[PDB]
Amino acid sequence: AFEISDFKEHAKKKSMWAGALNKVTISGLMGVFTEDEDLMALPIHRDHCPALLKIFDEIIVNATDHERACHNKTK
Amino acid sequence: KVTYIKISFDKGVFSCENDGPGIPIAKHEQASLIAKRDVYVPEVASCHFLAGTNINKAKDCIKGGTNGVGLKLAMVHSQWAILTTADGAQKYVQHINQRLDIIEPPTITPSREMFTRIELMPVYQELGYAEPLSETEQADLSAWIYLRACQCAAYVGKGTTIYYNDKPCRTGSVMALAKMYTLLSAPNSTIHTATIKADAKPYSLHPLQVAAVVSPKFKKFEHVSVINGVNCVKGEHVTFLKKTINEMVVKKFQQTIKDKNRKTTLRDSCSNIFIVIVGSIPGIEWTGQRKDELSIAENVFKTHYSIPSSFLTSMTKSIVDILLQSISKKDNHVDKYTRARNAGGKRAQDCMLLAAEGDSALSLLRTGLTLGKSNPSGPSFDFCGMISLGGVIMNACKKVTNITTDSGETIMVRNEQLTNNKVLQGIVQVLGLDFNCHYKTQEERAKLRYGCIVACVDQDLDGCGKILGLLLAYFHLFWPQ
Amino acid sequence: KTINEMVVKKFQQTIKDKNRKTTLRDSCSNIFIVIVGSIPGIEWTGQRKDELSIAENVFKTHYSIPSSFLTSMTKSIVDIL
DNA sequence: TATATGTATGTGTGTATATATACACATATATATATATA
DNA sequence: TATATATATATGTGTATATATACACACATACATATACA
């Protein structure tokens, strides 16, 4: 059967947008952990959802985009 | 079934045709409601983004397709394209031009054929190429497509022929693929093979075929993967094989080494490996439309798959051989050899090699070959070399074995002591001899570096009899011609 | 590649063996690098932006790595080599 | 799962064949290494 | 361009040592390749 999808349902079903929509092994996955006033970058040896990290990432890069866009400006 | 996939690439035009059931020649209701005109299924399949039969993929589905996007990506990068598809009662021809801007109405006739063909001209100029393609661009693109077809031919089932520009594609096995990729770095090499099976459905329905070559002249680890038909370049299946091989390699390295302290990692384990992995994996996901990288939990393989131990053992053996060899290759890389001026060139067969017995003999011969005008009719270093026989030659007649193989031929395999003799290694490297040659024809007898070996030995009974007879016995036992 | 070319040069210099041939894996397997900044005109391989796409010559034509950094790096790496 | 059973290495003796290496000592020369100048 | 290192070579008469190959055969150590099975 040939189906036509909209953006919404597509993005919920398809991994092409943000990565896998379930937990997979992400090679090089790191996080920052505090050990007595010291930041350490440590590996996270546990599967996680790439799309879940992407929704954080998309907003964060929108913010840093705005920062560059405004850095030579008045406001 | 699909019995063939014909791919062609000629004068810029690219074409692909398969012969299973065609795409349904039928009106698409919802697509027509959207378009407010009559739209058939092939037009949705080729012109409607996010549309296809894989929008709702099953967890067990091993098709590469998932997004309903790829075909329209082809159309959008086509100056012109032709979709032709027949279902056994009708044929359907639709032309899709100007990067999906002009979608001509289709033409539907009766036909009893059954097939699907996409034919198109890319926008080479818009994409950075010459118009028409240059000699180099054309040859590069043809080679790349030819490669992709070979990969299909290894992934596709056994009732399906893959054609490229009408010739069938040879490489129906991962061994064929391995040989193709290593024909230059490592011709005539050993191909480790494995069929990696799983015990639980759906994984047990899809064995992974694997072929690997292991060579000291491989500089880094390297894999070729066709997974679900996709030539992807990153995925935890590779890491599964890498880690398994490494664990075994570390175990046997610490076993075989009596140093017992050195610690090697995955780069040491795997940098001499080239692997081809071909097959289907259900339930995988990708990191984008390109499908460069598959996404999966590593434990899928730890739980379900097992690499056959014979393959692991073979691989570990080859790799640990290389490891110890690399540790002691610095002591292999000092013989006494005076090269003639014309050794190995255009007049190489005009040259002699005066193999003397020690170093005082070389003092005599170098005194003799330098009488420049006291001997105007004599020889000199323009066509004469020198080398030392190192005392007494080893014999090979007591240090070799004729072993009988299955085809009915006894091959003559040497000893590890005879192989590592520094004197005979010197004359083989100097003369350029080859052990598996026979030198029956003159076309083979002109591939050497000198024209004759000349034994300048002593005339006392020891040097005239013993080491000259052992030199004759060596040359008789390996090259009587 | 830049660090490797310098590392190979100084390795053959410092070594009096003068025959051994090392590649990029030998050169670089003891390196951890952080690179931060902006590059105009790049493209990606998908929405995720895991991989940027660019002609290598952009850097060969336009950018230069300061030699003091290259020298320091090559020194540390050849010490390990 | 123990058993043989035919494979392959491996020092060892006398009389031969052909080589290799560390150190001391005095003084003139050398080729690249180094400051600090800047 | 300069003043300054620290290592580096060669000569005669001395002080010390190392190592490859042939040749025969009784003997020692290492599998490994089957063959009943189990």
Author numbering:
A (entry chain A): 3 to 77
B (entry chain B): 78 to 410, 415 to 562
C (entry chain A): 320 to 400
Task: Provide the publication's sentences verbatim.
One intriguing example is the African swine fever virus, which stands as the sole mammalian-infecting virus encoding a type II topoisomerase. Prior extensive structural and biochemical studies have elucidated key aspects of Topo II catalytic mechanisms. These structures have unveiled the inherent architecture of Topo II, which is characterized by two principal heart-shaped functional domains: the ATPase domain, responsible for ATP hydrolysis to fuel the molecular machinery, and the central domain, which interacts with the DNA duplex and contains a catalytic tyrosine residue that cleaves the DNA duplex. As a result, Topo II not only relaxes DNA supercoiling but also disentangles knots and catenates potentially detrimental to cellular function if left unresolved.
During the course of cryo-EM image processing from the dataset, we determined three distinct full-length pP1192R structures, each characterized by a unique orientation of the ATPase domain in relation to the central domain: pP1192RF1, pP1192RF2, and pP1192RF3. The atomic model of pP1192R-DNA complex encompasses a homodimer of the GHKL, Transducer, TOPRIM, WHD, Tower and Coiled-Coil subdomains, alongside a curving DNA duplex. A pliable short linker (aa 410-420) interconnects these two domains, accounting for the wobbling of the ATPase domain. Collaboratively, the TOPRIM, WHD and Tower subdomains constitute a positively charged DNA binding groove that accommodates a DNA duplex. The DNA duplex engages in an extensive interaction with the DNA binding groove of pP1192R. Meanwhile, the Tower subdomain presents an additional β-hairpin, referred to as wing-2 (847-860). This wing-2 motif adeptly intercalates itself amidst the base stacks of the bound DNA, facilitating a global DNA bending of ~150° and a localized DNA conformational transition from the B-form to the A-form. However, the ATPase domain retains a flexible conformation, which likely correlates with the energy transfer dynamics intrinsic to the DNA cleavage/stand passage process. In the full-length structures, a continuous wobbling characterizes the ATPase domain, suggesting a plausible correlation between the rotation of the ATPase domain and the oscillatory behavior of the central domain9.
